[PDB]
Amino acid sequence: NGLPVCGETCVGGTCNTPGCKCSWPVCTR
């Protein structure tokens, strides 16, 4: 079970993936 992520996790309400929004808990569009 693993949906495509654009980047890291939005832990601490923080997303660090440039160009990708957050979809807690993962940075995905």
Side-chain angles (χ1 to χ4, degrees):
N1 185 330
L3 297 178
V5 297
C6 182
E8 296 300 289
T9 37
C10 297
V11 293
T14 310
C15 178
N16 66 331
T17 311
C20 289
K21 51 171 282 297
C22 173
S23 315
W24 198 88
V26 295
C27 297
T28 46
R29 293 186 172 193

